[PDB]
Symmetry: C4
Subunit: 222 residues, 4 copies
């Protein structure tokens, strides 16, 4: 029987069936969006949900006993378990968030489907080349998120009144979203020297933000 389950899991029909449950449940999860729906067919789908998660457990379990240790060294299956375990967390009570994170089980179409897996892994293999820069940037923010707070948090509490609020406000300034009209120009009505903080921050941040990309294109071309 050891092998009876093996031929099930590795069969193309098995993969076909999982993907079918995905694309179907993918649709129907976006239908519990409609209020009209969750009245006419509302009872219908919370159960169909309970159905699909039940099958995936079997499938994810079938994958377990068939692959033994092969299952738990492959990110896609570890993700499958979590993204199933998430939806395995009870519907009732608990926290409302887990009632929502079930939708992550539609990234299982990135698992169950091979062509996406490559696009994904192609992008992630690129990540490590950046980590030397991402770290500095985080320190850089940290050294700046701190200064902003004790420079501007006094009269501008919402934006800089907290290291957390400064980190948010600094990220937004990095994104350049309303940084001047919304944040800096108001700031200067009180501290006319604010442009010495945020202009250098912006230049440094954008400059460094660029090199990261060339650092990527340089890697592949070299």
């Amino acid at each position: 029987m050891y092998l009876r389950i093996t031929n099930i899991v590795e069969s193309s029909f098995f993969t076909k069936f999982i993907i079918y449950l995905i694309v179907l449940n993918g649709i129907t999860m976006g239908l519990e969006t409609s209020k009209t729906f969750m009245q006419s067919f509302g009872v219908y789908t919370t159960l169909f949900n309970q159905i699909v998660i039940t099958i995936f457990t079997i499938e994810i379990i079938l994958r377990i006993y068939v692959h033994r240790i092969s299952f738990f060294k492959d990110p896609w299956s570890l993700f499958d378990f979590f993204v199933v375990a998430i939806s395995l967390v009870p519907t009732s009570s608990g926290f409302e968030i887990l009632r929502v994170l079930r939708v992550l089980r539609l990234f299982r179409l990135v698992t169950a489907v091979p062509q996406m897996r490559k696009i994904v892994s192609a992008l992630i293999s690129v990540i490590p080349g950046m980590l030397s820069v991402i770290a500095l940037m985080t320190l850089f923010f940290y050294i700046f998120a701190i200064m902003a707070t004790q420079l501007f948090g006094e009269r501008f509490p919402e934006w800089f009144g907290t290291l957390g609020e400064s980190f948010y406000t600094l990220f937004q300034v990095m994104t350049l979203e309303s940084w001047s009209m919304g944040i800096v120009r108001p700031l200067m009505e009180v501290y006319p020297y604010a442009w010495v903080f945020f202009i250098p921050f912006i230049a440094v941040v954008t400059f460094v933000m660029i090199n990261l990309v060339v650092a990527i294109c340089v890697d592949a071309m070299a």
Copy 2:
């Protein structure tokens, strides 16, 4: 068969079509003026039908000359569409179609070869990218849903529907007013809204960035492979 062809294949023919386009092209940008469309309003409302009726004739003549080859040529199909588009009667129907006639000024992109190359050069990029647009389309969809069932209750205008979440997420992707316009107000009710939109902005920007780093490497691989 050959009597019409030498007319059709003449350099004068290609020269002649382009003339009608820019003619209608200019004049379509002249039917814009209110001053214009009364004194010469009647004058010009005809010239359109003139240009397209000839275009129809042009579109009519061109078919039999190339036979099935006409409907295997992408460039001609748009001429056909935007001639067919412009052929549809003015009255009733939908107001939208009086405007899609103006697409027949992208028919100035068809008859000219120099345009054909630039365009397909841009489009030849699509298939290598298509794998990523798909992943992105999924990514949005999995998030447009969550926003709807997280924020649409108290923020209907932005997230009250999968459609409005899809919009609001696209706008956040473009980074236009994501924080001051959407997240900061969102955080006034869900002080944890930034845990949704900050990662999305990163992931989405992450992906968008790689798409170009996948293209520029694709081309600096032609010149690092011919170099052998």
Copy 3:
């Protein structure tokens, strides 16, 4: 003839001009100060005319020394233009030419070699793009019209004119307030307005993407 030529082509000539350039360059940024233009207002409107007075000789020296080479040289044609601009009388006429005088600080791009190349290095890039500036320009034109006759009725400042559409389309291209400022209000009247502006933004940027990759290549 060569007596002036050996003067004109001398490095001291180049050095002295650049000195005059940087000099008048500074002084233009002081006609900005209100404090300045009263106490030292007389001082500088003349020094302006002074520096502009010298520049005529230099361009004339450059002319006869370079003969026709001067009027086939963009740098000399440009230098000449920005002197001719500054040659227009200070009083009356149009105030713009008293202001366009400041363009004579791009004459620091001529007399200085490193600038000449950086500028020309940037411009040699242009011809490969003109194929796209054209198609985009057409792309705008075919859309700016449609914007006018769809939204210009109820939204006049933004789309009420082919001209106002071009401006509003440039802004949407840059993505500045494109959604909050333009589309979301537009949608209050035409709930399908997003089918216009998303492809425009997509196509426009996708094109603006390719222009850059084409440059690194």
Copy 4:
């Protein structure tokens, strides 16, 4: 004794120990932000700082004589020295600004740690290729900041009423933040041709700022 002290500095324990205080002072700098803290163990921490900076000074002192003039031809140590010397400047009176500039000594976590230096020096090695264009950019701005002042400072003082404020507003337009809705559209209600000024500026400047990236990608690919 000359060499007796020298072997201390390069010891595995020595380098490790400074980085220790850096992250320590690095951490502790981010707690003087919270008001809750500055009472129970706030006093605890006002003291802990003076310890760290005193050691940081000593550390910087040892490095000098051991390296002799070699300390003052090395940018990395001079920053440590400066960013510690900064922290040596008296607390009382003066300007509040210096209570904030202490935190830059957590960029001493970029010095005291070797692995960052390369990524950093890679970014700085990029700078010279831009200076040819960075200058022209600066040239371009100045010629325009003047025009804006003497075109728009009349009715729009906040934005262009001074060469300095025009320079500010021009950078803001360069970043494209609210350039149309925030500045140009209001400008056009009084100067309906203002768009002939800012569209080319935006075009050329963007024309240029992108060339900077080529100038980066080209030069760094050599």
